Amino acid sequence: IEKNFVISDPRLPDNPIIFASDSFLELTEYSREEILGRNCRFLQGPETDQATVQKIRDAIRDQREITVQLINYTKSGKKFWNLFHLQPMRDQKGELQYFIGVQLDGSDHV
């Protein structure tokens, strides 16, 4: 159904990643041990558009899905366009439980 994704737990301090797919590890160049328990903002850097970061922050605040594009960086500092989709995940009682974040490398590396 999906390839690059992480799951965060917003009920833990600073909404840490608690699950990452094998593909996300490949995309970002980080190991599972290097990722788990951190907020995904570590992928950001100098050319990340702060207006877009604000949009994601607001979408998380409002618990709404969003589909944006933003500059991210791999472990080794390789800049890429992240085509990013956020989706809140609620339990049957309607209470927020997780966020799923889906990433795609929107850059051509010919």
Ligand X SMILES: Cc1cc2nc3c(=O)[nH]c(=O)nc-3n(C[C@H](O)[C@H](O)[C@H](O)COP(=O)(O)O)c2cc1C
Query: Which chain residues interact with ligand X by CB under 6 A?
Result: 6, 8, 15, 39-41, 43-44, 53, 56-57, 60, 70, 72, 82, 84, 86, 99-101, 103
* CA–CA dist 18, 35 (Å, integer): 8
39 annotated ligand-binding residue: yes
* CA–CA dist 8, 99 (Å, integer): 5
Q: Where are the alpha helices (DSSP H) in the chain?
A: 22-28, 32-35, 50-62
57 annotated ligand-binding residue: yes
In the bound state with ligand X, the residue whose beta carbon lies nearer, of 6 and 30, is 6
72 annotated ligand-binding residue: yes
In the bound state with ligand X, the residue whose beta carbon lies nearer, of 43 and 108, is 43
- Terminal-residue alpha carbon distance, the chain: 27
- Binding-site residue numbers for FMN are 39, 41, 44, 57, 72, 82, 84, 103
